[PDB]
Amino acid sequence: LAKGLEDVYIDQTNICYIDGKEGKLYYRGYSVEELAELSTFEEVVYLLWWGKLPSLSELENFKKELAKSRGLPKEVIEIMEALPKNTHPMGALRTIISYLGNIDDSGDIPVTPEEVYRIGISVTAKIPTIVANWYRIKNGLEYVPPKEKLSHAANFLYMLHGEEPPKEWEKAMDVALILYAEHEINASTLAVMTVGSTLSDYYSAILAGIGALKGPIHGGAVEEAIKQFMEIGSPEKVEEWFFKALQQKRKIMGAGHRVYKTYDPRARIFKKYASKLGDKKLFEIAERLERLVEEYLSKKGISINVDYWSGLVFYGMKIPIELYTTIFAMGRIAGWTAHLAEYVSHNRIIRPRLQYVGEIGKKYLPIELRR
């Protein structure tokens, strides 16, 4: 019985490698550290989909395809304006992406590698526009069209705030997208691949990813983690909160990982940005709790994961907490697209089994003879 499908390898891959015991991560052979420091989201997406770093012209041309794909048709904006104003961002994105599929000429076409990347360019480019403007529309703010000249990351901050961001913000945001871009076969990527394995359409597949990423013990933890520090209140109450949580068997959000049994390499980088951009008190609370996790839960293999420090970074960039998981989606769409294309290149329906326990051969008894 492979519960949680733990350590079950479902296919070969050339996209990303994770070293859980050592806490190392590579995107097509390049460490996440190197990319976070020297690359950009656009270049990383290019690398993830085509397997190598782009040339000067390859990157400029790809950046151009994306830029001209950020806009949303008027009917899409109309549907956004029709959503219940209280709809949470991930759920709103889910519906909007589904509607985008309905209006796309290729919305029902069975996935193939080439077509997946084509649609991927459009959806990847569009998510930030949907997320930022959903926040605006749900709050009675004016819709802000994308700015072709800004980077993917800068343009998101631009549409959301209605003003171009400072260099340090474009950098933190871009790095955040790179760090969230890809992570092998996590739950959301598995869901995307499972839908793709039936040769369904691109949108149906990405929607499964969105649904899975939304979960509080998956991508949703980015929001639960920061709310958790806020719940603790002050650095002085951390310890008492920690032992109560352990006693209660409560999950410490932002901690633990199916693969990493040591500090998440992405968490190291996020902590660095949270240190320089995050709220001093919250960072203090987070660091205090972090030490307790390392002290008592490390032998168990529970360390800090990617969703622990990222919220503080986004919060420091004046981004509402309700949009953090959608930002994870803004980045992960790259990895989802890469995996969907890779899996269906040599497709095989994903269909496992369950071990039935119970009686078989029970005889039907008319309802009137039942007690």
Ligand X SMILES: CC(C)(COP(=O)(O)OP(=O)(O)OC[C@H]1O[C@@H](n2cnc3c(N)ncnc32)[C@H](O)[C@@H]1OP(=O)(O)O)[C@@H](O)C(=O)NCCC(=O)NCCS
Start-to-end C-alpha separation, the chain: 37
Task: Give whole-number Cα distances, 196 to 10, 166, 307, in Å.
Answer: 14, 39, 27
How many angstroms separate the most distant Cα atoms in the chain?
78
Least gap, CB of 183 to ligand X (angstroms): 11
Cα 259-264-266 angle, rounded to 5 deg: 125
Find which of its own copies, ligand X, none residue 316 binds, CB within 5 to 8 Å per kind. Answer: none
Question: Of residues 259-318, which lie at the interface with its own copies (CB under 8 A)?
Answer: 259
Environment class of 11 (CB within 10 Å of its CB; exposed 0-12, middle 13-18, buried 19+): middle
What is the rounded distance in angstroms from the CA atom of residue 281 to the CA atom of residue 278?
9
**Both structure tokens of 66:** 């994306």
Known active-site residue 161: no
The answer to whether 246 contacts its own copies (rule: CB under 8 A) is no
Question: Of residues 310-349, which lie at the interface with its own copies (CB under 8 A)?
Answer: 348-349
Contact between 193 and 343 (Cβ < 8 Å):
yes
Question: Of residues 91-110, which lie at the interface with its own copies (CB under 8 A)?
Answer: 91-92, 94-95, 98-99, 101-103, 107-108, 110
The answer to whether 350 contacts its own copies (rule: CB under 8 A) is yes
Least gap, CB of 62 to ligand X (angstroms): 31
Q: Which of 65, 78, 81, 295: binder of its own copies (CB under 8 A)?
A: 78
What is the rounded distance in angstroms from the CA atom of residue 270 to the CA atom of residue 311?
9
Residues 6+ apart with CB under 8 A from 285: 229, 232, 233, 234, 235, 238
The answer to whether 196 contacts ligand X (rule: CB under 6 A) is no
What is the distance, to the nearest Å, from the Cα of residue 203 to the centroid of all Cα atoms in its chain? 16
The answer to whether 203 contacts its own copies (rule: CB under 8 A) is yes
Q: How many residues bind ligand X (CB under 6 A)?
A: 18
Choice among 174, 201, 264, 307 that is catalytic: 307
Q: Which of 67, 93, 221, 289: binder of ligand X (CB under 6 A)?
A: 221
Least gap, CB of 288 to its own copies (angstroms): 27
Least gap, CB of 297 to its own copies (angstroms): 17
Contact between 127 and 93 (Cβ < 8 Å):
yes
The answer to whether 258 contacts ligand X (rule: CB under 6 A) is yes
What is the distance, to the nearest Å, from the Cα of residue 121 to the centroid of all Cα atoms in its chain? 17
Known active-site residue 257: yes
Query: Which residue's CB is nearer to ligand X, number 4 or number 366?
Result: 4
Find which of its own copies, ligand X, none residue 254 binds, CB within 5 to 8 Å per kind. Answer: ligand X
Environment class of 17 (CB within 10 Å of its CB; exposed 0-12, middle 13-18, buried 19+): middle
The answer to whether 210 contacts ligand X (rule: CB under 6 A) is no
Contact between 341 and 49 (Cβ < 8 Å):
yes
The answer to whether 199 contacts ligand X (rule: CB under 6 A) is no
Question: Of residues 304-333, which lie at the interface with ligand X (CB under 6 A)?
Answer: 305, 307
Residue at 104: amino acid letter: D
What is the rounded distance in angstroms from the CA atom of residue 123 to the CA atom of residue 70?
8
Contact between 343 and 110 (Cβ < 8 Å):
no
Find which of ligand X, its own copies, none residue 186 binds, CB within 5 to 8 Å per kind. Answer: its own copies
The answer to whether 255 contacts ligand X (rule: CB under 6 A) is yes
Choice among 174, 257, 264, 339 that is catalytic: 257
The answer to whether 252 contacts ligand X (rule: CB under 6 A) is yes
Query: Which residue's CB is nearer to its own copies, number 83 or number 144?
Result: 83
What is the rounded distance in angstroms from the CA atom of residue 13 to the CA atom of residue 124?
22
**Both structure tokens of 235:** 């650095």
Residue at 167: amino acid letter: K
The answer to whether 183 contacts ligand X (rule: CB under 6 A) is no
Least gap, CB of 223 to its own copies (angstroms): 11
Residue at 95: amino acid letter: T
Query: Which residue's CB is nearer to its own copies, number 15 or number 172?
Result: 15
Q: Which of 218, 271, 332, 339: binder of ligand X (CB under 6 A)?
A: 218
Residues that bind ligand X in the complex, under the rule CB under 6 A: 4, 217-218, 221, 251-258, 300, 302, 305, 307, 348-349
Question: Where in the sequence numbering do the catalytic residues fall?
Answer: 257, 307
